[PDB]
């Protein structure tokens with residue numbers, strides 16, 4: 001049909017920063033995670049390399065996508081599809097050419113795919129303060145992140161869902177460790193420590209004459225992949241304004257719902273969660289100045305000069321939001 005044709009046309013931009021992910025979600029019948037993952041797996045030749053039966057891949061991905069909540073405005077299948085595709089573009093950065101193996105590329109993409117699965121739309125601190133079963137289970141540390149990992153891996157055991165069935169036992173062990181390491185690093189309470197170590201690597205940075213990153217041990221390699229997916233998770237303000245504003249609208253809607261829960265329980269309403277006392281534009285400038293820019297400037301330095309266009313878009317967007325403040 002015309003819908004399938006226009007979908008295939010949008011997917012041609014899968015290697016570009018600024019893919020029309022919302023449009024893809026609409027055209028695919030709300031299956032952006034399934035179709036983008038499938039497209040990326042074919043593009044990187046990941047099915048033949050790891051002998052993943054195509055029917056097995058689709059079955060797992062549709063199941064995975066079903067476990068992201070439709071009624072959660074930001075942390076849903078669209079956010080997952082976006083982080084996956086953003087990770088995919090960062091992996092193709094010239095400074096990282098031939099740096100990671102096929103197993104590490106699969107780990108980073110699969111981790112991005114599951115990184116927020118089954119998100120209930122409330123934060124770690126909210127789950128802790130409300131004496132929830134999740135926080136009780138995970139002893140108050142990376143409560144959501146440990147949960148997203150458990151569900152992402154448990155789903156592989158459903159009928160015809162084990163996409164890793166043809167990997168060796170050692171390959172399975174290695175991928176699992178890498179995925180756990182990456183998803184735990186998406187907990188914002190770890191942001192400051194990741195960034196500091198990223199800056200340390202930037203100072204001691206070793207490269208070839210063409211500027212390709214030389215990363216020999218696990219510690220250095222997993223550190224770059226953790227920051228890569230972390231950067232993808234914090235990529236909304238670096239995308240074309242039309243996309244960023246939509247993400248902003250969704251996170252504010254999610255945060256206000258949490259704030260509405262906090263108000264009726266008699267709790268102190270969390271930052272940016274009070275719809276009656278908000279400053280959406282100031283909060284975005286604050287988000288860029290204190291979190292997103294310091295991270296992306298450091299990443300830019302690691303892969304100089306390949307991230308220059310991403311950084312320019314970030315500063316343009318910051319300038320625009322600032323202008324909306326009287």
Ligand SMILES: CCOC(=O)c1c(C)nn(-c2ccc(N)cc2)c1C
Pocket residue numbers: 186187188233234236237244247248251284287
């Ligand atoms: C598009 C605008 O997004 C945000 O403002 C924002 C803030 C503030 N925190 N977060 C956020 C970042 C990382 C994680 N893991 C959860 C929430 C986002 C997306």
Ligand SMILES: [Mg+2]
Pocket residue numbers: 115116144186187
């Ligand atoms: Mg998360």
Ligand SMILES: [Zn+2]
Pocket residue numbers: 079083115116186233
């Ligand atoms: Zn996320």
